[PDB]
């Protein structure tokens, strides 16, 4: 769910 | 466990309210969170739920007894609920007495060798009246209790057997097999009388047979049970051999079990058509099945003469295929044929020893090795044959080792001059090198025997043995008896005592 969410912050 | 404790006050107020259907929710959840702290708040709700105007709350509360027995169960309240569940066995509804029986029976496994002590007619006559009423599953639990019970004399056994005799039952497997368990324990009643024994085995055949028309998994369960029932009393299923012929699309596990039963029910008469079946079974494609077939051909030869020559002929026909696992399974069964029919089939040895180059399975090697032991005198080069395994005596199964030891001294007692160095090598291996205390033992036992008196050694070791006699993969007779007492249950599926699974 939500491939676009950033890996860091 | 962790979520619930902080509001224990909810589930004590929830078992008390009106509405009889929604009083079991609180009662079943209270017993599933598992703690010491909950025992402070469960004691007095469980007391009041066991006599509820509605059967639903008694059903659930009778289970919560055996729930509580898992957690800190050594109380004067637990001695109070020992009374509270027995009084609930002569209860109006079937769904209440069913659970009472289940809980109480499982609690009897917390055993001081003195738990729910069967009080005979007053205890049992209420079970046998409740057993006619009880729900599908209730009947199971009630019958599984009855299996503990022992009777005194013949009419005691009869008046229980006549009650259960009506069990060509609905719950096709679960009930019927437990009824068989009861009817098969209570089977000592004039070992054959005039009429009751000789009709009880008439009535035991049909519901065993019709178990085979259920699903595959209970086909299997029923067949594992029938395998025992056929050992103990084979008179029950004497002529039903034709039912256990293997149907084409049977699942492998059913095929394998049916095949065993076929061999047990084979006779002087039917053998002709049993072989006809075995020959085709050996052409099938699953390996395990093929093996059990070719094994079973050997088992026929031993079980019935005349089929002797035929069966051996077809076993060699099998060896000539040069399929390794067929040859290995065959050459094993041929050992036991030499044992039932000694000195007749000697000439085969030639053909067998051709193949020994490729026997990887322990059973097969030990079979061959023993064959050279007993027939060393006839085989000129037994010397060199047995000497071949020694090279790697370790890296070889303890089955092979013990047999090789015994076989070599058999040879030495037969050919002592041309043998000295060999027995010394083997008894050295068995004695000094070996780690298996029991191998070492037998090494010494032989070395001591031979070196003390060869005149005696020859008479001890090479004594005329007796013959093996139609046993053909038979179970340990005292173990059989124990397993029969567990008929419906998992030990009957496995053919081991319950004491091999904690």
């Amino acid at each position: 769910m939500s491939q676009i969410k950033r890996l860091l912050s | 466990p962790d979520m619930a404790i902080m509001a224990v006050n909810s589930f004590v107020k929830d078992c008390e309210d009106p509405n009889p259907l929604i009083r079991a929710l609180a009662v079943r959840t209270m017993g599933c969170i598992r703690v010491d702290k909950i025992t402070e708040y469960l004691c007095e709700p469980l007391r009041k739920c066991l006599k509820d105007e509605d059967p639903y709350v008694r059903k659930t509360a009778a289970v919560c007894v055996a729930k509580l027995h898992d957690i800190n169960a050594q109380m004067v309240e637990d001695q109070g609920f020992l009374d509270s569940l027995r009084d609930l066995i002569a209860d109006s509804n079937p769904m209440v007495v069913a659970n009472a029986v289940a809980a109480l029976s499982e609690i009897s496994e917390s055993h001081p060798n003195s738990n729910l002590l069967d009080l005979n007619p007053q205890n049992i006559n209420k079970l046998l009246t409740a057993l006619n009423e009880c729900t599908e599953w209730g009947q199971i639990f009630i019958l599984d209790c009855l299996s503990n019970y022992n009777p005194k004399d013949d009419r005691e056994a009869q008046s229980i057997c006549e009650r259960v005799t009506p069990r060509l039952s609905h719950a096709n497997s679960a009930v019927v097999l437990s009824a068989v368990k009861v009817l098969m324990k209570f089977l000592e009643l004039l070992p054959k009388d005039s009429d009751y024994y000789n009709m009880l085995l008439k009535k035991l055949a049909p519901p065993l047979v019709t178990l085979l028309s259920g699903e595959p998994e209970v086909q299997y369960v029923a067949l594992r049970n029938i395998n025992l029932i056929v050992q103990k009393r084979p008179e029950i299923l004497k002529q039903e051999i034709k039912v256990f012929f293997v149907k084409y699309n049977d699942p492998i596990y059913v095929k394998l079990e049916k095949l065993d039963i076929m061999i047990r029910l084979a006779s002087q008469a039917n053998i002709a058509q049993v072989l006809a079946e075995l020959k085709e079974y050996a052409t099938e494609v699953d390996v395990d099945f093929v093996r059990k077939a070719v094994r079973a051909i050997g088992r026929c030869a031993i079980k019935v003469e005349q089929s002797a020559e035929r069966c051996v002929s077809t076993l060699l026909d099998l060896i000539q295929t040069k399929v390794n696992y067929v040859v290995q399974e065959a050459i094993v069964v041929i050992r036991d044929i030499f044992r039932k029919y000694p000195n007749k089939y000697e000439s085969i040895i030639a053909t067998l020893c051709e193949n020994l180059d490729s026997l990887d399975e322990p059973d097969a090697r030990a079979a061959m090795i023993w064959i050279v032991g007993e027939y060393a005198e006839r085989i000129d080069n037994a010397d060199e044959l047995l000497e071949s395994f020694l090279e790697g005596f370790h890296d070889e199964s303890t089955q092979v080792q013990l047999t090789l030891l015994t076989a070599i001294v058999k040879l030495f007692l037969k050919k002592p001059s041309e043998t000295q160095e060999l027995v010394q090598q083997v008894l050295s291996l068995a004695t000094q090198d070996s780690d298996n205390p029991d191998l070492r033992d037998r090494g010494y036992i032989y070395w001591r025997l031979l070196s003390t008196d060869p005149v005696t050694a020859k008479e001890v070791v090479l004594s005329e043995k007796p013959l093996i006699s139609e046993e053909t993969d038979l179970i340990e007779p005292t173990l059989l008896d124990e397993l029969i007492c567990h008929i419906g249950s998992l030990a009957s599926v496995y053919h081991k005592p319950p004491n091999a699974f904690v």
């Binding site: - | 598992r34 599953w137 599984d144 299997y220 249950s489 998992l490 699974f501």
Partner: protein
Amino acid sequence: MIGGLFIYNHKGEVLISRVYRDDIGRNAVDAFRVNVIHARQQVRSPVTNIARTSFFHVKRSNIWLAAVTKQNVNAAMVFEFLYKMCDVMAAYFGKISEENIKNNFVLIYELLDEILDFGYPQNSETGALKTFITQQGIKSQHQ
């Protein structure tokens, strides 16, 4: 009696589960996956034993239904119960598959409570427990 009822897919993910007893730790579910679901030998039998833990199983299309126990249960009784369970799922949501399981997370566990307390099979039919179980509204008729 029955101390664990587990239901897998063909790949060996766990679709539903229900431990009933202290006897059976959750790693049992791995023990079934490892040793039977993905065994190298597909010619076995229904009941397997592993570390004194006995594993009953029955397939429906690609869904494994499995019973577990450490006790010496009435073996007939466990398969019988798994069959009576597969009878209930049909009248309550039709075909046996992953889709119909994903719909009925709610229904499955509520049936698990009504048919089975502390390992004992209680009682089971579409009528006698109709308003004693709450389902949904619209079913799965596609497939």
